[PDB]
Enzyme design. Structure first.
Site, PDB file in Angstrom:
ATOM      1  N   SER B  49      30.591   2.610  -3.550  1.00 46.24           N
ATOM      2  CA  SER B  49      30.330   1.720  -4.685  1.00 46.24           C
ATOM      3  C   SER B  49      31.387   1.757  -5.803  1.00 46.24           C
ATOM      4  CB  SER B  49      28.934   1.967  -5.258  1.00 46.24           C
ATOM      5  OG  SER B  49      27.939   1.757  -4.276  1.00 46.24           O
ATOM      6  N   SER B  97      24.522  -1.316  -8.856  1.00 44.43           N
ATOM      7  CA  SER B  97      25.339  -1.190  -7.653  1.00 44.43           C
ATOM      8  C   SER B  97      24.913  -2.191  -6.571  1.00 44.43           C
ATOM      9  CB  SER B  97      25.298   0.251  -7.134  1.00 44.43           C
ATOM     10  OG  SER B  97      26.198   0.446  -6.062  1.00 44.43           O
TER      11      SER B  97
END
Ligand SMILES: [Co+2]
Ligand SMILES: [Co+2]
Lengths: 238, 246
Positions: B49, B97
């Site tokens: 991420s 995310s």
């Protein structure tokens, strides 16, 4: 913002703290603001440290502030507050409300050039000894909107730089840009003013707010943050 | 630049938790870095991420993302995480995310232009093969800690092959904690867990603006158990705290 609406239930927070003030709140998609006092919302008061916002934009725009990474180094002379007696970034200078730093920025921009930008920005207005600059809460929220939408007579870069410097709180869900003002303690007859201006980004929405209050006790300064918090909490925002 | 320097001293907290990891730390004015492991610092891992950072900038540059007030609208299709099932702003899609929002951006960016900007940023081994949009989480793209830190320095100083305004937008999207005395920019990354020999990776990359100074950090660790995850945040903290930052 075109049409301004009264929410008289808000006055409970003010009255519980025995505070004369005005909160103005605007949802971005609404193009209409709400308040507790219709008359006090459009009433003009000394911007105090909140002036550091249009100050920082003009300062960048004129090249007086070269870029965001410019340090304002302490010359050596004893400044009025201890918090000011250290080197400062742009966010540093704004958050500790370092008057001398912005005084020096204001000097080398110039009185006339400053006035030119304030005109374009539509920031408060003037009034035969001087006539100090005063601003309405309605004008603050209108001001910050143009700053947020990147619609001021400045580059988007310069608006973006100032905005990060205005970041005061951050959580995964929201981001708070704000700036405080305090013009000094006053009397009951003649009071000082305390400001809190800014906006709260939550979810896919944006809420602009300007709060001011009469201040005649040193001790009541922190109320400039609890009144607008308690209102925005119960509004269903934070 | 200046330098990096092993300092086994920090290993304290790692042994404390049995964690195989690395922290890089860099004083910006000193133009120098400091780590617990020179070997692991340069070892290239799955960005996971943390890869959203480049993807945001590439998306802005390419016109894919119109500007900072772009809303990434949720179609109503079910998603893996409750947090992603809502409309999102840029900061939002980076904070929670949101994989599918950024997967969409990767795909509108294309393999070609993803190569272009990733080459220009010197982001990782730059190798994007396998899947048009999986390169972050479980693809071929890999990046070192030192490279993270390098990249993030270039972002702070607006030195990338991307316009300043787009660089500033994403910089704001990254603000994760604000105080009067300091400001914090970071992203977390997490590729997954388990072994069958091969364990997952977990990142925390950001920088801290304290007074006149600024400290860049990248961090990674090996994860085979889901629970030791928060140590990706807490360990880098505990060290910065000891060194006197926050
Ligand atoms: Co913002
Ligand atoms: Co920053």
């Amino acid at each position: 913002m075109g049409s301004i609406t009264e929410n008289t239930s808000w006055n409970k927070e003010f009255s519980a703290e025995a505070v004369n003030g005005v909160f103005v709140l605007c949802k971005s998609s609404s193009k209409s603001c709400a308040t507790n006092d219709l008359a006090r919302a459009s009433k003009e008061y000394l911007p105090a440290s909140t002036f550091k916002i249009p100050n920082a934009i003009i300062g960048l725009e004129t090249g007086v502030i070269k870029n965001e990474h410019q340090v304002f180094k302490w010359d050596g002379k004893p400044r009025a507050m201890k918090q000011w007696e250290r080197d400062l970034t742009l966010r540093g200078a704004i958050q500790v409300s370092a008057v001398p730093v912005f005084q020096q920025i204001a000097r080398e921009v110039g009185e006339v050039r400053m006035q030119k930008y304030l005109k374009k920005f539509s920031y408060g207005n003037q009034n035969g000894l001087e006539g100090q600059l005063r601003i309405s809460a309605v004008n603050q929220v209108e001001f910050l909107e143009s700053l947020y939408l990147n619609k001021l007579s400045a580059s988007k870069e310069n608006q973006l730089i100032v905005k990060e410097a205005l970041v005061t709180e951050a959580a995964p869900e929201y981001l708070v840009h704000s700036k405080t003002g305090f013009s000094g303690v006053g009397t009951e007859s003649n009071p000082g003013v305390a400001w809190w201006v800014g906006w709260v980004e939550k979810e896919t929405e944006v809420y602009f707010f300007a709060f001011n209050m009469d201040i005649d006790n040193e001790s009541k300064l922190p109320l400039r943050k609890s009144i607008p918090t308690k209102i925005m909490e119960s509004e269903g925002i934070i």
